[PDB]
Design an enzyme around this catalytic site. Structure first.
Site, PDB file in Angstrom:
ATOM      1  N   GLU A   1      20.551 -19.944  66.971  1.00  0.00           N
ATOM      2  CA  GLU A   1      20.892 -19.521  68.334  1.00  0.00           C
ATOM      3  C   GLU A   1      21.990 -20.589  68.905  1.00  0.00           C
ATOM      4  O   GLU A   1      21.733 -21.759  68.542  1.00  0.00           O
ATOM      5  CB  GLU A   1      19.741 -19.457  69.181  1.00  0.00           C
ATOM      6  CG  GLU A   1      19.604 -18.377  70.169  1.00  0.00           C
ATOM      7  CD  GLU A   1      18.364 -18.564  71.224  1.00  0.00           C
ATOM      8  OE1 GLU A   1      18.128 -17.491  71.790  1.00  0.00           O
ATOM      9  OE2 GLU A   1      17.912 -19.418  71.283  1.00  0.00           O
TER      10      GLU A   1
ATOM     11  N   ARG B   1      16.980 -14.730  67.211  1.00  0.00           N
ATOM     12  CA  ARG B   1      16.884 -13.851  68.460  1.00  0.00           C
ATOM     13  C   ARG B   1      18.009 -12.949  68.069  1.00  0.00           C
ATOM     14  O   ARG B   1      19.174 -13.245  67.605  1.00  0.00           O
ATOM     15  CB  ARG B   1      17.058 -14.615  69.596  1.00  0.00           C
ATOM     16  CG  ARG B   1      15.844 -14.780  70.632  1.00  0.00           C
ATOM     17  CD  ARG B   1      15.958 -15.655  71.668  1.00  0.00           C
ATOM     18  NE  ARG B   1      15.243 -15.927  72.594  1.00  0.00           N
ATOM     19  CZ  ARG B   1      13.953 -16.995  72.220  1.00  0.00           C
ATOM     20  NH1 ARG B   1      14.310 -17.329  71.047  1.00  0.00           N
ATOM     21  NH2 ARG B   1      13.124 -17.365  73.068  1.00  0.00           N
TER      22      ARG B   1
END
Ligand SMILES: O=c1ccn([C@@H]2O[C@H](COP(=O)(O)OP(=O)(O)O)[C@@H](O)[C@H]2O)c(=O)[nH]1
Ligand SMILES: O=c1ccn([C@@H]2O[C@H](COP(=O)(O)OP(=O)(O)O)[C@@H](O)[C@H]2O)c(=O)[nH]1
Ligand SMILES: Nc1ncnc2c1ncn2[C@H]1C[C@H](O)[C@@H](COP(=O)(O)O)O1
Ligand SMILES: Nc1ncnc2c1ncn2[C@H]1C[C@H](O)[C@@H](COP(=O)(O)O)O1
Ligand SMILES: [Mg+2]
Ligand SMILES: [Mg+2]
Lengths: 228, 228
Positions: free
Chosen positions: B34, B96
């Site tokens: 991320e 994610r």
């Protein structure tokens, strides 16, 4: 394929009015209006983000400015697939370009302290990556600067009547004016799109009133378009 | 030609920690962390928009949430062109996905009244168009849900130590927890990406402590990956 001319100008200067005259002088000339319509009614009655920026600039400038440029990129990329793609000598006129969005307005809002560092940094970073994924397609082949005193614009802003922009002071219209002069006239304003330096720029003085007398302006455009 | 698995989880649940163990178990497995790094320093000294969101959510949620998802789309599309594109059986793990950005966090911020109607409408509209221009490329082939009590996460948030997220209360971690349970476990949460309904979802209970004992988890992944 299609030649993309951008019609730059101030607020209520007269692009639309002007391009509409052009639009109906050949069926190989299609226009891509500024998506102002949707900026006044955010949807997929919704909110009027244009007004939000005007009421509280130090709070909605970023949001608006981001949305406004995206909505344009879409609107333009979209028109690139219209039935215009077929005709012989096609021309697609843009009501303002992603360049003036960032370098004239966003830029000026930042300088007017309506965008903190972070907002301006993010705005640019995004704007850059954006025209690097769909750049190719939208590169301009020419620009037509409809020049007009910020006074005239202030006047036409009143004639038009959008209630959102009725509070705009001359100071504002002025600041944006210089931003245009600096970029398209004196060409002293540097961008981050190297190719813009070698772009033809026709400048027309629309301070008069072309609603009626416009024969002149038109010829200068046919003229300008030939040289492309 | 690369299989894209997404590693979903709460805050400080343990994706990174986990995927790092996976990353070095084969040179055909590359990770796409991320971009938190850049969220803490916009244009890498700049501003820390992650912190801005935490300090005044009702003001920076939109900006952050927008930037955060963009930065991810880029980061992921970017990795799709890595030298990994050459190996035999390639696997790209995402920390994610754009889905959890919108459906777990942005969504929840909206419900927490940290995004007025307009912000949420614009956010969605943008998010939709975004995954319609670069959708194809990033569609997932699987999802691994690292499940963990919001308590454990609150604890690990403290062990990690990012000063921005040190004020996070359990209530918050909790709200986000259910959002995960609802989407990846009970699958009762509807998205706007039809294909997500037919996506394999491995759920691992990382509440324990896999720093050391993780042999188990790993096998379940090799297992899961085979079935793809
Ligand atoms: O010679 C002119 C040119 C324009 N207008 C006014 O300009 C307004 C439109 O301004 P416009 O929307 O075209 O500015 P733009 O959107 O093109 O930037 C119209 O209502 C016209 O009444 C005018 O009165 N006389
Ligand atoms: O079994 C474990 C797994 C992780 N951690 C802690 O989890 C932190 C990292 O949380 P992480 O950043 O991986 O959450 P994520 O970013 O993956 O969502 C590390 O500092 C570890 O000390 C731990 O204490 N025990
Ligand atoms: N790029 C950008 N940033 C901020 N505000 C903008 C921008 N473009 C248009 N506008 C707004 C400001 C004026 O009120 C109006 C001008 O529409 P017009 O057709 O240009 O006369 O729309
Ligand atoms: N999508 C999204 N919206 C808002 N805030 C986010 C998002 N993703 C990460 N974060 C922030 C919130 C936590 O402090 C931290 C979690 O990083 P993590 O690796 O997720 O544990 O980063
Ligand atoms: Mg107009
Ligand atoms: Mg991490």
């Amino acid at each position: 394929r299609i030649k993309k001319i951008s019609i730059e100008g101030n607020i209520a200067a007269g692009k639309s009015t002007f391009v509409n005259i052009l639009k109906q002088l050949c069926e190989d000339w299609e226009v891509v209006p500024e998506p102002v319509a949707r900026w006044c009614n955010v949807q997929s009655n919704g909110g009027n983000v244009l007004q939000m920026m005007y009421e509280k600039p130090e709070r909605w400038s970023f949001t608006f400015q981001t949305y406004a440029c995206l909505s344009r990129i879409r609107a333009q990329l979209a028109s690139l697939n219209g039935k215009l793609k077929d005709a012989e000598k096609p021309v697609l006129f843009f009501e303002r370009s992603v360049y003036s969005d960032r370098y004239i307005f966003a830029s000026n809002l930042y300088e007017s302290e309506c965008m903190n560092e972070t907002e301006w940094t993010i705005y640019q970073d995004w704007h850059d990556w954006m025209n690097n994924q769909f750049g190719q397609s939208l590169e301009l082949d020419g620009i037509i600067y409809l020049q007009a005193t910020p006074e005239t614009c202030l006047h036409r802003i009143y004639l038009r009547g959008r209630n959102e922009e009725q509070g705009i002071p001359l100071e504002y219209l002025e600041k944006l004016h210089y931003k245009h002069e600096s970029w398209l006239l004196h060409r002293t304003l540097k961008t981050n799109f190297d190719y813009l330096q070698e772009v033809p720029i026709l400048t027309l003085d629309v301070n008069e009133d072309f609603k009626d007398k416009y024969e002149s302006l038109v010829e200068k455009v046919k003229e300008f378009l030939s040289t492309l």
